[PDB]
Amino acid sequence: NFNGLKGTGVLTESNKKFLPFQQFGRDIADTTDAVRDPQTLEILDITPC
Amino acid sequence: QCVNLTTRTQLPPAYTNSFTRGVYYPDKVFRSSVLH
Numbered sequence A: 001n002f003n004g005l006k007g008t009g010v011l012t013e014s015n016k017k018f019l020p021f022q023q024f025g026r027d028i029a030d031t032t033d034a035v036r037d038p039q040t041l042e043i044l045d046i047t048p049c
Numbered sequence B: 001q002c003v004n005l006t007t008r009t010q011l012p013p014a015y016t017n018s019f020t021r022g023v024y025y026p027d028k029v030f031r032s033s034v035l036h
């Protein structure tokens, strides 16, 4: 869960450069597939297990 | 202290062709190598 965004997956460190105003990233299917961590400001990939 | 100026010059303003500017990020979300 990040900021209320519940889901099951494998987290990984990412090279997707979210700009300062962004918090989540999404795929062509309109689902969140990356999210910056609200405590330490890095971007995490989300992949289904 | 708020004194207006008589020196106003009236002339109809020019038009200019704004080519492809004024796009902005439409929502607070990341997307990449995609058409949306």
Ligand SMILES: *[C@@H]1O[C@H](CO)[C@@H](O[C@@H]2O[C@H](CO)[C@@H](O)[C@H](O)[C@H]2NC(C)=O)[C@H](O)[C@H]1NC(C)=O
Pocket (backbone or CB within 6 Å): B002, B003, B004
């Ligand atoms: C400054 O000038 C403007 C006009 O450019 C004045 O506005 C006018 O005010 C009178 C009443 O005093 C109105 O009858 C007019 O219709 C107003 N004209 C416009 C174009 O707004 C304004 O009162 C002036 N103020 C000072 C402090 O000189």
Ligand SMILES: *[C@@H]1O[C@H](CO)[C@@H](O)[C@H](O)[C@H]1NC(C)=O
Pocket (backbone or CB within 6 Å): A039, A040
């Ligand atoms: C959490 O808060 C404490 C004190 O307010 C601070 O020292 C700490 O760095 C914070 N955590 C992070 C990840 O910054």
